[PDB]
Amino acid sequence: ATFEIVNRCSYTVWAAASKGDAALDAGGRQLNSGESWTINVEPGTNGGKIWARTDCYFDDSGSGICKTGDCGGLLRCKRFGRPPTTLAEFSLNQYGKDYIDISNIKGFNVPMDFSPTTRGCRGVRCAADIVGQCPAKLKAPGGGCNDACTVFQTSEYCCTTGKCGPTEYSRFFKRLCPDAFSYVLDKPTTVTCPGSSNYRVTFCPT
């Protein structure tokens, strides 16, 4: 499957793509404002994520640091990134269907649209100014708006027992972005697309 990753933000982002134990495609790249990066993701990929990283410094070897979404100091991510990260999540060719969503479970850094470029399903977006409106206790110094599990590490926020409810913090994310997951047991906002669809992820869609 083809994903085109487009940076419409006015600032540089460093896109990342991983399935947690391996890179997808090259795993990461710098995107200046307006640049597009096209990746190929193997059919059958389960548990893939794409995200943006901000305020990164990398040396010639591709080693460095980012203020949001750092994936162990690497330009080319093999593992998932450090919160806060708005996430585009997908599982492809799962019994004939692809499943896509946007999640705020690991916080929010950059607004995002995640849409098919082929026919037969809808896209999803979270484009509100979550960073500007972020509750004081969830604001990340480096930038972004952390989820409450990251900040407080309680069973209730992290849904450790598999039983948890919405919280004042989850409802903040949900009010601003209803079509994104706000906590682990949120009513699913997953979209079902035809198997082998192609997609575009746009940072700063609006």
Contact 91, 45 (CB under 8 A): yes
Burial 44-59 (b: 16+ CB within 10 A, else e): ebeebbbbbbbbbebe
Contact 23, 81 (CB under 8 A): no
Give dist(CA 165, CA 86) in Å, integer: 21
Give dist(CA 166, CA 205) in Å, integer: 28
Contact 2, 8 (CB under 8 A): no
Ordered structural domains, the chain, with CATH: 1-206 (2.60.110.10)
Residue position matching structure tokens 């896509």: 100
Give dist(CA 57, CA 172) in Å, integer: 31
Phi, psi angles (nearest 5°) of residue 155: -60, -35
What is the DSSP code string of the chain? -EEEEEE-SSS-EEEEEE-SSSEEEEEEEEE-TT-EEEEE--TT--SEEEEEEEEEEE-TTSBEEEEES--TTBSS-SSPPPSS--EEEEEEEETTEEEEEEE-TT-BSS-EEEEESSSSS--EEE-S-HHHH--GGGB-TTSSB--HHHHH--HHHHTTTS-----HHHHHHHHH-TTEE-STTSPP--EEEETT--EEEEES--
- Please count the residues of the chain: 206
Technique behind this structure? X-ray
Q: Which two tokens stand for residue 38?
A: 């096209």
Could you tell me which of 125, 122, 127, 80 has the C-alpha nearest to residue 98?
Answer: 122
Give dist(CA 65, CA 85) in Å, integer: 15
HSE value, Cβ hemisphere, 13 Å, CA-based, for 167:
20
Q: Which two tokens stand for residue 88?
A: 């585009």
Resolution (A): 1.4
Q: How many CB atoms lie within 10 A of CB 178?
A: 13
